Amino acid sequence: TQQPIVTGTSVISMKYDNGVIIAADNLGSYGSLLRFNGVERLIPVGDNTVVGISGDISDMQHIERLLKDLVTENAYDNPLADAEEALEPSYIFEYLATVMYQRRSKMNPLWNAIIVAGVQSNGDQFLRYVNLLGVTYSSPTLATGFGAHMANPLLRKVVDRESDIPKTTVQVAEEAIVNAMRVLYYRDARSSRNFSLAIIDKNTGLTFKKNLQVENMKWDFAKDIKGYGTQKI
Template sequence: MDHSQERWGRPRSDVYGPYQYAIHNAGAGSGPSTATQQPIITGTSVIAIKFDNGVILAADNLASYGSLARFTDQERLIKVGKETVVGMSGDVSDMQYIEMMLERLIIEDDYAQDGHNLRAPHIYEYLSRVMYARRSKVDPLWNAILVAGKKDDGSPFLAYVDLLGVTYSSPSLATGFGAYLAVPLLRQLVSDEGDEKSVTEAEARAKIEQCMKVLFYRDARSLDKYTIATTYLDGEVKIEKDQRCQDMSWRFAEHIRGYGTQKV
């Protein structure tokens, strides 16, 4: 059967005139406009917690191609402006696109040279609108994002936005599997707004390192090499790369029923 559109289902040439083949060939070679429906190269959890003098974030350096641990040097914590850090999980290509957008935003803001800089709440509001606008076009950026820095009143700022444009803030946050594995541990230190005032940087960092170790044990898409970023209330940002989980041991697996040759 001949299913060619040129030979059936079109107006009769003897009634309506010659068929306009330009209509049939429109867009030939380029195909229809499509949107990403599934992330390809992905990064896993980003975790963060407030403390009395700022915010600490951490994200491992693995970018996975499906279940393949393909890239082991992918940085997912990005310094934006002078005093803000953005951490992203999800599709790496979309993350790079967002990074480019933020770079342009900072450059345009610097044109004014009026002594004012974009702070974390401003960047967060910008990202929340970008993510919601892309979701509304059914062409989302496949990422979950944490934004950390300080507010205009000088207090720590930490908030979340995802590919649906969902936004919320909390003194401890995580994306990916970290939302299930790390947040309960982080809430041992801070569970409500204001709890961070009694938490020191050393305590917050120790808890972050514990969470990264748990994620490496439990999340198959994670890595034991990670980056830690710390934002302080005085505007300083410190980024420490190539951190490693310490004192790793898989001996605990021997006590799990059904592991290896052990009988259930």
Template sequence: MNHAPEEWGRPRNDIYGNYNPAFHNATPSAHTQQPSITGTSVLAIKYDSGVMLAADNLGSYGSLARFTDIERLIKVGEETVVGISGDVSDMQHIELVLEKLMIKDNYEQDGHRLRAPHVYEYLSRLMYNRRSKVDPLWNAILVAGRKDDGSPFLAYVDLLGVTYSAPTLGTGYGAYLAVPLLRKLVSDEGDEKNVTKDQARAALDQCMKVLFYRDARSLDKYTVACVDNTGAVSIETGVRCEDMSWRFAENIRGYGTQKM
């Protein structure tokens, strides 16, 4: 007698055809339910002649600072920069998808060039499509560049497909700690016309320092990218927070009222 489970009570081959046991080796589909290696905040601000972004280089495995050389500002095409926070493996997937998109666009050779608004619309559809499949890409994304008329472009999309635009944006912890600092410089649409490139850079440097002080999943090494109104992209890597000091914390003794 054959005691193999696949033989129990199955229909006869001469009536129903040959039995296919391959399904016993099939594995159920699995969706990522929570990120493993993650990157924290991405910050961006418009200024009078472009957009500037900053993101640190840390990849955290839970509370472990696992990788310190993760680049999360990605140049897409000739005049667009995409900053991604969240799951690093999903970020690498998005990077591969965008690379294929650029290759396909270059093959067309029709004189049309994908700019930041086009990349942003593509990513918003991609994120919403994955969310609708209950298999989201665990990322928040900032897209920076310029519009067809040369004006600065900056917009946000997250794992739910939520989209919006603002002159200052942040993801992760930076949306709570850094964006209020950036809004002191650019509080409303149009204010960026009064902000120079040097002022925008100083504001981002200050915010990255604050995040290193306050965000346990951040690093003092970061990357800064800039897209000006001509479409030129410059990316500066290996930037370090300067004049760091922890003297303010030397008298802290836990929480609540305590005798020093």
């Protein structure tokens, strides 16, 4: 029985030929007050997974804690903790899925939307979503909040179906991701310019970039607009 307070906006992601990319900005909004400007919302779990979270920040922070503990406790009496019995993206996701649906069923949800992106032991990309109601689904592209509306249409023009994944490059993909991010800054009143991006490639492993910014902005055209119809100057 709650109501989010400090929040974070979209998280966008897509999977490519040899990995997956995911991103999210660094803002913690308090209603219409863009309150916190240094909030990482992309959570790296191990070396093959990043979980992006949007929704109530306090619950996110709680999920951060749950994730560290999940790691700590997998090391326990596990000789293969840094290998064959390391946390796979699917394990992390199914755990989180499970928790979300249990909290919704108790009527005390974790007010979030989460995307778990990563690559499995055998090389398969993994990208899936779960939210405050325990609804889960997967697609070559995935986004939460505004990103579902704006980013998905864009990200899908690159990967419209499964067969397109093997034909898509990191460069293509990352380009897309950054554009979508730019778009969102233009049309989402709750976005911020600063963001974090992360790629999880079956070869390069996990690359996590911090402090990216939306650039190449088209605002120049604003000068030729005056009034709202009949006004001349």
